[PDB]
Design a binder for this molecule. Structure first.
Ligand SMILES: COc1cc(N2CCN(C)CC2)ccc1Nc1nc(N)c(C(=O)c2ccccc2)s1
Length: 342
């Protein structure tokens, strides 16, 4: 009949009314997004005299409890970053309002998908992609700090926010799917497009899955299209193999879900099960990026900082981020020292 004295709906979400005053402090403007966790809203903080995003968690135990884990990690990240210089959206404060847990963040304006949509999915330049890459590798180095050891677990374009148009800077948002390095409790994780092979294979995993996600994102930021746009896990694996070839046998012999995508011949090699696809590793990244052919779809022909030399450095890096072996895949510190960033 009514939910939470009328303040809530079916899904335990707070019904947001335009121009409502909570606590003589926050002035609600408009809803900016919806998710499984609850809602996000654009508000004006009267005390600090600034705009904020407020994450209104659902009035439901499971969602409260999940968001309390998120709070715990965000405040652990504040302890290790008082200067706010590692390109992370930071928790300002949290509070209870009409039985909802609300997390207050600084308000950014657009996500990286918006940026892409504004290019009509043709991409931004390599000079913009460089800057964003350095900042993301900085963010991951920080996450990999031994006391934090945090896996974001859902790096995709909507979880990367643009600071502001003349500042040319990005930040990582939404640590609600995040956890610290540990014994494996979860298996169906990451967004499919950016899901790593260790995850698709049901193998152990660590902070290197986030670097796989970043390999994909950076190719997408310069091409405008996702690198591996799988319709399901089988099709995702197949798209990965098209570019990078069959994974190594030492890996596939260990992998508990190997037989979902591959099969073991009598000689002991692994090959693709049949489900349309190019043969293993013949869709080269060299050619997707258009290293010698004037960038993606010829659009970077004649533009400064888009030479063969420049493109090879970017390629080289991406290839190190898309290593099949999580042990040898490039870590954040070695990524920062790459010649792509000179
Ligand atoms: C003006 O507010 C935003 C609007 C958008 N969009 C742009 C308008 N739409 C085309 C798609 C969503 C994307 C992001 C924001 N701003 C946000 N700033 C922060 N700080 C956000 C979050 O903290 C956040 C909270 C929960 C999940 C994801 C992000 S969301």
């Amino acid at each position: 009949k009514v939910y939470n004295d009328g303040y809530d709906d079916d899904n335990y979400d707070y019904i947001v009314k335009n121009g409502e005053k909570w606590m003589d402090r926050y002035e609600i403007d408009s809803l900016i997004g919806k998710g499984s966790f609850g809602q996000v809203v654009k508000a004006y903080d009267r005390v600090e005299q600034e705009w904020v995003a407020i994450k209104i968690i659902k009035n439901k135990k499971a969602f409260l409890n999940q968001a309390q884990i998120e709070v715990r990690l965000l405040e652990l990240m504040n302890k290790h970053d008082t200067e706010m210089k590692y390109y992370i959206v930071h928790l300002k404060r949290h509070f209870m309002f009409r039985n909802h847990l609300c997390l207050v963040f600084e308000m950014l304006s657009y996500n990286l998908y918006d940026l892409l949509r504004n290019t009509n999915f043709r991409g931004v330049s390599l000079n913009l992609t460089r800057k964003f890459a350095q900042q993301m590798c900085t963010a991951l180095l920080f996450l990999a700090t031994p006391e934090l050891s945090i896996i974001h677990c859902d790096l995709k374009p909507e979880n990367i926010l643009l600071c502001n148009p003349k500042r040319s800077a990005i930040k990582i948002v939404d640590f609600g799917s995040s956890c610290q390095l540990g014994q494996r409790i979860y298996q169906y994780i990451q967004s499919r497009f950016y899901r790593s092979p260790e995850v698709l294979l049901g193998m152990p995993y660590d902070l290197a899955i986030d670097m796989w996600s970043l390999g994909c994102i950076l190719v997408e930021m310069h091409t405008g299209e996702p690198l591996f746009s799988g319709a399901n896990e089988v099709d995702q694996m197949n798209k990965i193999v098209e570019v990078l070839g069959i994974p190594p046998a030492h890996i596939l012999d260990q992998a508990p879900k190997a037989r979902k995508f591959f099969e073991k011949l009598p000689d002991g090699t692994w090959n693709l099960k049949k489900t349309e696809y190019k043969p293993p590793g013949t869709r080269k990244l060299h050619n997707i990026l258009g290293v010698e052919t004037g960038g993606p779809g010829g659009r970077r022909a004649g533009e400064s900082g888009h030479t063969v030399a420049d493109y090879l450095k970017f390629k080289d890096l991406i290839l190190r981020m898309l290593d099949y072996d999580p042990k040898t895949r490039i870590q954040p510190y070695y990524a920062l020292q790459h010649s792509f960033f000179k």
